[PDB]
Enzyme design. Structure first.
Site, PDB file in Angstrom:
ATOM      1  N   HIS A  41       0.804  -1.223   0.000  1.00  0.00           N
ATOM      2  CA  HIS A  41       0.000   0.000   0.000  1.00  0.00           C
ATOM      3  C   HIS A  41       0.833   1.267   0.000  1.00  0.00           C
ATOM      4  O   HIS A  41       0.297   2.347  -0.259  1.00  0.00           O
ATOM      5  CB  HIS A  41      -1.044   0.015   1.138  1.00  0.00           C
ATOM      6  CG  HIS A  41      -0.489   0.435   2.459  1.00  0.00           C
ATOM      7  ND1 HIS A  41      -0.153  -0.501   3.412  1.00  0.00           N
ATOM      8  CD2 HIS A  41      -0.236   1.673   2.951  1.00  0.00           C
ATOM      9  CE1 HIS A  41       0.296   0.175   4.451  1.00  0.00           C
ATOM     10  NE2 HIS A  41       0.256   1.490   4.229  1.00  0.00           N
ATOM     11  N   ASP A  89      -0.462  -7.563   2.092  1.00  0.00           N
ATOM     12  CA  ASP A  89       0.163  -6.246   1.948  1.00  0.00           C
ATOM     13  C   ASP A  89       1.712  -6.304   1.922  1.00  0.00           C
ATOM     14  O   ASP A  89       2.384  -5.620   2.701  1.00  0.00           O
ATOM     15  CB  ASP A  89      -0.355  -5.300   3.047  1.00  0.00           C
ATOM     16  CG  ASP A  89      -0.023  -3.845   2.767  1.00  0.00           C
ATOM     17  OD1 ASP A  89       0.207  -3.498   1.592  1.00  0.00           O
ATOM     18  OD2 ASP A  89       0.008  -3.067   3.713  1.00  0.00           O
ATOM     19  N   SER A 183       4.560   1.558   8.251  1.00  0.00           N
ATOM     20  CA  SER A 183       4.246   0.376   7.427  1.00  0.00           C
ATOM     21  C   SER A 183       5.432  -0.020   6.562  1.00  0.00           C
ATOM     22  O   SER A 183       6.207   0.829   6.152  1.00  0.00           O
ATOM     23  CB  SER A 183       3.013   0.589   6.556  1.00  0.00           C
ATOM     24  OG  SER A 183       1.825   0.805   7.297  1.00  0.00           O
ATOM     25  N   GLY A 184       5.601  -1.306   6.359  1.00  0.00           N
ATOM     26  CA  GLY A 184       6.688  -1.845   5.548  1.00  0.00           C
ATOM     27  C   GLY A 184       7.920  -2.154   6.361  1.00  0.00           C
ATOM     28  O   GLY A 184       8.796  -2.917   5.931  1.00  0.00           O
TER      29      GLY A 184
HETATM   30  N1  LIG Z   1      -0.622  -0.094  14.211  1.00  0.00           N
HETATM   31  C1  LIG Z   1      -1.422   1.009  13.600  1.00  0.00           C
HETATM   32  C2  LIG Z   1      -0.729   1.610  12.353  1.00  0.00           C
HETATM   33  C3  LIG Z   1       0.467   1.088  11.849  1.00  0.00           C
HETATM   34  C4  LIG Z   1       1.049   1.626  10.679  1.00  0.00           C
HETATM   35  C5  LIG Z   1       0.452   2.721  10.015  1.00  0.00           C
HETATM   36  C6  LIG Z   1      -0.795   3.227  10.478  1.00  0.00           C
HETATM   37  C7  LIG Z   1      -1.467   4.386   9.796  1.00  0.00           C
HETATM   38  C8  LIG Z   1      -2.223   5.316  10.531  1.00  0.00           C
HETATM   39  C9  LIG Z   1      -2.854   6.417   9.905  1.00  0.00           C
HETATM   40  C10 LIG Z   1      -2.672   6.636   8.526  1.00  0.00           C
HETATM   41  C11 LIG Z   1      -1.860   5.749   7.780  1.00  0.00           C
HETATM   42  C12 LIG Z   1      -1.578   5.953   6.308  1.00  0.00           C
HETATM   43  O1  LIG Z   1      -2.139   6.855   5.703  1.00  0.00           O
HETATM   44  N2  LIG Z   1      -0.683   5.145   5.710  1.00  0.00           N
HETATM   45  C13 LIG Z   1      -0.185   5.181   4.378  1.00  0.00           C
HETATM   46  C14 LIG Z   1      -1.053   5.246   3.263  1.00  0.00           C
HETATM   47  C15 LIG Z   1      -0.516   5.240   1.955  1.00  0.00           C
HETATM   48  C16 LIG Z   1       0.878   5.163   1.759  1.00  0.00           C
HETATM   49  C17 LIG Z   1       1.736   5.098   2.878  1.00  0.00           C
HETATM   50  C18 LIG Z   1       1.205   5.061   4.178  1.00  0.00           C
HETATM   51  C19 LIG Z   1       2.203   5.045   5.354  1.00  0.00           C
HETATM   52  C20 LIG Z   1       1.945   3.913   6.316  1.00  0.00           C
HETATM   53  O2  LIG Z   1       1.030   3.119   6.231  1.00  0.00           O
HETATM   54  O3  LIG Z   1       2.812   3.797   7.307  1.00  0.00           O
HETATM   55  C21 LIG Z   1      -1.296   4.618   8.423  1.00  0.00           C
HETATM   56  C22 LIG Z   1      -1.351   2.656  11.647  1.00  0.00           C
END
Ligand SMILES: NCc1cccc(-c2cccc(C(=O)Nc3ccccc3CC(=O)O)c2)c1
Length: 230
Positions: A41, A89, A183-184
């Site tokens: 994602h 993912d 994430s990742g």
């Molecule tokens: N354990 C809960 C947790 C763990 C990791 C991330 C989140 C979280 C919270 C709010 C918004 C988002 C977001 O927009 N992500 C995103 C969307 C598109 C591209 C990249 C990314 C960055 C990403 O995912 O890190 C993610 C929550």
């Protein structure tokens, strides 16, 4: 990372910052000299910009001798990485050149045997993700130690009703959690890569909404299949 601590400089040399035109988008984990594992994602924000991977970093902005930026030759998202579906993912990134390994740049072995990590096992999650709910971004790598939660409890109605498959694992999210920008990145148990951060419900630090991680052992044959196409 919420409720974590600044990591010891270059103590997690497998850490990758996945960047778009030099802006931190997601974490990643070095799994081979020329491959980085991350979350599919993450490439939603990409569109038509240079996707690059920063290795050997502690700080995103400070000049560090071990810092090296590689271009991505190939982005291999898991075929079923349908957006907003927490499942599958995973993303493999092939770097422009074989990375030179050292004390600040080193891959992390991943679990291949399809066995669940024993609940309660302490695992280390690291990233450059936000450090509070407002969205404050750290410059240096943060980390936190989180215990693994049994799949059923994480699946449970209060947690994430029906959506936690065998290909996912969970960890405690009470005050301490992975959050936006993490994430990742990796969930490392006893020095072994076991999970890849995913965003799940996107709520951070709520005990009722546990952190979800892609279970890397569930994708062993898929990872091996891609890592041979190089
Ligand atoms: N354990 C809960 C947790 C763990 C990791 C991330 C989140 C979280 C919270 C709010 C918004 C988002 C977001 O927009 N992500 C995103 C969307 C598109 C591209 C990249 C990314 C960055 C990403 O995912 O890190 C993610 C929550």
């Amino acid at each position: 990372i919420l409720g974590g601590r600044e990591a010891e400089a270059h103590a997690r040399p497998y850490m990758a910052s996945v960047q778009l035109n030099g802006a931190h988008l997601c974490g990643g984990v070095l799994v081979a000299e020329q491959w980085v594992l991350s979350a599919a994602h993450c490439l939603e924000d990409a569109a038509d910009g240079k996707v690059q991977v920063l290795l050997g970093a502690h700080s995103l902005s400070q000049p560090e001798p071990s810092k090296r930026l590689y271009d991505v030759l190939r982005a291999v998202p898991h075929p079923d990485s349908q957006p907003d579906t927490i499942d599958h993912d995973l993303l493999l990134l092939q770097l422009s050149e074989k990375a030179t390994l050292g004390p600040a740049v080193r891959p992390l072995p991943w679990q291949r045997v399809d066995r669940d990590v024993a609940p309660g096992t302490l695992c280390d999650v690291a990233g450059w993700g936000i450090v509070n709910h407002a969205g404050r971004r750290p410059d240096s790598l943060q980390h936190v130690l989180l215990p693994v939660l049994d799949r059923a409890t994480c699946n449970r109605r209060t947690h994430h009703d029906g959506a936690i498959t065998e290909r996912l694992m969970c960890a405690e999210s009470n005050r301490r959690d992975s959050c936006k920008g993490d994430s990742g990145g990796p969930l490392v148990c006893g020095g072994v890569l076991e999970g890849v951060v995913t965003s799940g419900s996107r709520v951070c630090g709520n005990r009722k909404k546990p952190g979800i991680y892609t279970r890397v052992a569930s994708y062993a044959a898929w990872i091996d299949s891609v890592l041979a196409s190089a």
